[PDB]
Design an enzyme around this catalytic site. Structure first.
Site, mmCIF file in Angstrom:
data_model
loop_
_atom_site.group_PDB
_atom_site.id
_atom_site.type_symbol
_atom_site.label_atom_id
_atom_site.label_comp_id
_atom_site.label_asym_id
_atom_site.label_seq_id
_atom_site.Cartn_x
_atom_site.Cartn_y
_atom_site.Cartn_z
ATOM 1 N N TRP A 133 35.195 59.803 -7.277
ATOM 2 C CA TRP A 133 36.357 60.580 -6.226
ATOM 3 C C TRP A 133 35.826 61.516 -6.714
ATOM 4 O O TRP A 133 35.851 62.410 -7.655
ATOM 5 C CB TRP A 133 38.000 59.560 -6.884
ATOM 6 N N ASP A 214 42.831 55.383 -13.937
ATOM 7 C CA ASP A 214 43.222 55.888 -12.692
ATOM 8 C C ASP A 214 43.835 54.717 -11.742
ATOM 9 O O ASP A 214 42.505 54.188 -11.253
ATOM 10 C CB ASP A 214 42.395 57.067 -11.777
ATOM 11 N N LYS A 250 49.137 54.848 -1.234
ATOM 12 C CA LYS A 250 48.303 53.643 -0.823
ATOM 13 C C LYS A 250 49.652 52.390 -1.078
ATOM 14 O O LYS A 250 49.745 51.905 0.485
ATOM 15 C CB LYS A 250 46.805 53.630 -1.207
HETATM 16 C C1 LIG Z 1 44.749 58.144 -3.725
HETATM 17 C C2 LIG Z 1 43.895 58.420 -4.910
HETATM 18 C C3 LIG Z 1 44.089 59.244 -6.001
HETATM 19 C C4 LIG Z 1 45.579 59.944 -6.222
HETATM 20 O O1 LIG Z 1 45.852 60.272 -4.814
HETATM 21 P P1 LIG Z 1 47.693 61.170 -4.276
HETATM 22 O O2 LIG Z 1 47.674 61.110 -2.889
HETATM 23 O O3 LIG Z 1 47.647 62.377 -4.812
HETATM 24 O O4 LIG Z 1 48.557 59.949 -5.047
HETATM 25 C C5 LIG Z 1 43.724 59.135 -7.079
HETATM 26 N N1 LIG Z 1 42.215 59.069 -7.684
HETATM 27 C C6 LIG Z 1 42.258 57.634 -6.670
HETATM 28 C C7 LIG Z 1 41.052 57.074 -6.773
HETATM 29 C C8 LIG Z 1 42.417 57.960 -5.087
HETATM 30 O O5 LIG Z 1 42.308 56.905 -4.384
#
Ligand SMILES: *Cc1c(COP(=O)(O)O)cnc(C)c1O
Ligand SMILES: *Cc1c(COP(=O)(O)O)cnc(C)c1O
Lengths: 401, 401
Positions: A133, A214, A250
């Site tokens: 990411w 994560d 999500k």
């Molecule tokens: C969604 C996402 C996050 C964190 O997203 P937030 O909107 O800050 O909760 C962290 N890691 C991955 C791989 C994500 O897709």
């Protein structure tokens, strides 16, 4: 006083570029596959039912707006850990973990990074999968840590480079930090299979690495909360004391409410209290205490049997839709007479799919088909609906023919 | 494992201790003067009526929970800047300011600090008044800046060491950062008078210091939003391009929803855009985007004439109760036969008051009266009610006689 004359305009966001062009397009057939949040079959944002209900509940109780403890809402942090570790987890039952509320997954990742920078004396190197990411880089970098990488994605097969992964990891200096995506790798959708996770665990254990999980898609990936947390749970069972970041952005569609948490697996409950005092010290001067709304909402759902039950069905519907779209996309490409292998599309898990399309093919899809995505060939499956999967299959075929 | 074996227990929080000791108390006449938030006459948390109305409005619209832009809710940021700077402000009208939503006042201060550590190449030193709010230290320290101080509170008079301040500021290295509390200084309640502010503006201007205003009590101090922002507005009008942090925690009672903002006054609209861009790059890796609830509420109130109207009445109501308690405390002490000079109590502004009491006396109050406060002699006036003010004065008389 011309204090900022030397501040340069930061570079523009590419994804932003894609969204903007998409917005400007007049063709009613346009598709936005650069979208970062779930969208329903009608291409609209979706607030779960259980969320509406939880909200109505809070409203009904005429709750105050008083500051939450630095660490956040206890009912929330507890439910959060239980969610991740499993009700019957030994780590959970013995209370040897410490979970603090963070500003969604991001804030939780950062708190964790800052905690390592401060107390993890063994190393400053955090190894990321290639790719990872985007935000992971500067999160760790801003925190004062050094970035390393391990092979992950195989452009050849649009799958896992198990060989490279294993070779890279086997050479990681002991007591280094390795970041792993719990499930639904972002942005490729390529996740290890059970047997592969069993092997990665064995090496992480052997090389005595600190594993940082994560977990942003628990339940959203396969529609099953237990299955999605399998690998994380397996590591901990093998005696690997991980660190973890959870997001409800999500799985609960809490996006903007920012509900998430950071968890440290400790040796015992005592050690947990010490670690927790230190996390409190770190957080205060960051933002003092966390936002209450998202946590209040999540806690209710998780702690209210009827809501929780309803949540599971809903998260499942979401997962099912995405899977169905992957399925249908593959099927239609065949129907179109695509001689190509599009298996990866169905092998991939979650919202993101690395298609294998080349930069040039992407341009054409944009220019000619009004289908918007980034040049990496990554598509957000969220932008695909029953009504356009056919069109997408068609378009992909034309540029790959 | 044994990654955390060396992580030790953090220092116990004092404010925390008084609150807990307070709870563990049986005296029905007990008082908690350690409370950091406003309390009504019945000693209860107070959620504003205009706040309940904004929430009902939001609820009715069935809003999405989609991520806010990094910089936050635009209606919120603009309203926020307008509240601070004033509608006819030239800084406002010209668009030579940049406002980003922060995680209340503390997260805004932190973003601000991180921004300065990054781009404020002229110096690393931040001058805090003596004393300042506890959190101010670790905020800056953690941001990577060096702390310095300037004389402020005069313990001999429980008032302002104007002379001391002026000499300290006059000797501050040019282009250094100076933190100023806009109104209702925390924790002393000692604020400069309009006339002294003029003089401070001048020295700040001449020494070419970067003035960082901390405005957590706008409207809450005097019941007047314009009067409370007077010093801020004055510096800006004198040509001092300040940086500022706002909190809606106290003035809107949004404690746990975490609504606040960070503002930078630039040379022009053009510079403001460059600055915004860099603030976004900074925040992304911190928490990605800000919590939407408090910003939604705050925005509604500021932007809706009827709500904003009602808001001003309620803030006024809060400010008045505090002023009344200061007034009644003094009168009661006199009446009790106290020969000590307690004018400071009425000269002070806001929820916090430096009583001038001594440790051993605080101890006495706690032990013999069931009156909890910190050993620094600071009491939260919010903890005083019309029904206990007499008790408090009596107790204070006793230990001071
Ligand atoms: C969604 C996402 C996050 C964190 O997203 P937030 O909107 O800050 O909760 C962290 N890691 C991955 C791989 C994500 O897709
Ligand atoms: C309240 C307070 C802040 C910020 O408080 P938040 O809860 O983070 O909004 C900043 N400065 C002072 C002096 C305060 O009293």
């Amino acid at each position: 006083s011309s204090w900022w004359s030397h501040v340069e305009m930061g570079p523009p966001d590419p994804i932003l570029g894609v969204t903007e062009a998409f917005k400007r397009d007049t063709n009613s057939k346009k598709m936005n596959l650069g979208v970062g949040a779930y969208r329903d079959d009608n291409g609209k944002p979706y607030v779960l039912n259980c969320v509406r209900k939880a909200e109505a509940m809070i409203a009904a109780k005429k709750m105050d707006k008083e500051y939450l403890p630095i660490a956040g809402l206890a009912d929330f942090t507890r439910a959060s850990a239980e969610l991740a570790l499993g009700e019957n987890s030994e780590a959970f039952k013995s209370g040897r973990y410490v979970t603090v509320q963070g500003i969604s997954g991001t804030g939780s990742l950062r708190v964790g990074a800052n905690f390592l920078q401060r107390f993890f004396k063994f190393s400053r190197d955090v190894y990321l999968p290639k790719p990872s990411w985007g935000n992971h880089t500067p999160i760790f970098r801003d925190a004062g840590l050094q970035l390393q990488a391990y092979r992950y994605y195989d452009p050849k097969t649009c799958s896992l480079d198990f060989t490279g992964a294993m070779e890279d990891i086997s050479k990681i200096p002991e007591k280094s930090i390795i970041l792993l995506h719990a499930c639904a790798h972002n942005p490729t959708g390529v996740d290890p299979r059970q047997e592969q996770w069993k092997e990665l665990a064995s090496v992480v254990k052997k090389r005595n690495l600190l594993a940082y999980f994560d977990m942003a898609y628990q339940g959203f990936a396969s529609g099953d909360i237990n299955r999605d947390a399998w690998a994380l749970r397996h590591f901990i069972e093998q005696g690997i004391d991980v660190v973890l970041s959870q997001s409800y952005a999500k799985n609960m569609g809490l996006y903007g409410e920012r509900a998430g948490a950071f968890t440290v697996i400790c040796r015992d409950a005592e050690e947990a209290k010490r670690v927790e005092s230190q996390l409190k010290i770190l957080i205060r001067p960051m933002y003092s205490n966390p936002p209450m709304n998202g946590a209040r909402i999540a806690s209710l759902i998780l702690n209210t049997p009827e809501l929780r039950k309803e949540w599971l069905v809903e998260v499942k519907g979401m997962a099912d839709r995405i899977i169905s779209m992957r399925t249908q996309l593959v099927s239609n490409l065949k129907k179109e007479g695509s001689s190509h292998n599009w298996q990866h599309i169905t092998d991939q898990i979650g919202m993101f799919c690395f298609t294998g399309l080349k930069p040039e093919q992407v341009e054409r899809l944009t220019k000619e088909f009004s289908i918007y995505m980034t040049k990496d060939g990554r598509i957000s499956v969220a932008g695909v609906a029953s009504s356009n999967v056919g069109y997408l299959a068609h378009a992909i075929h034309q540029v790959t023919k």
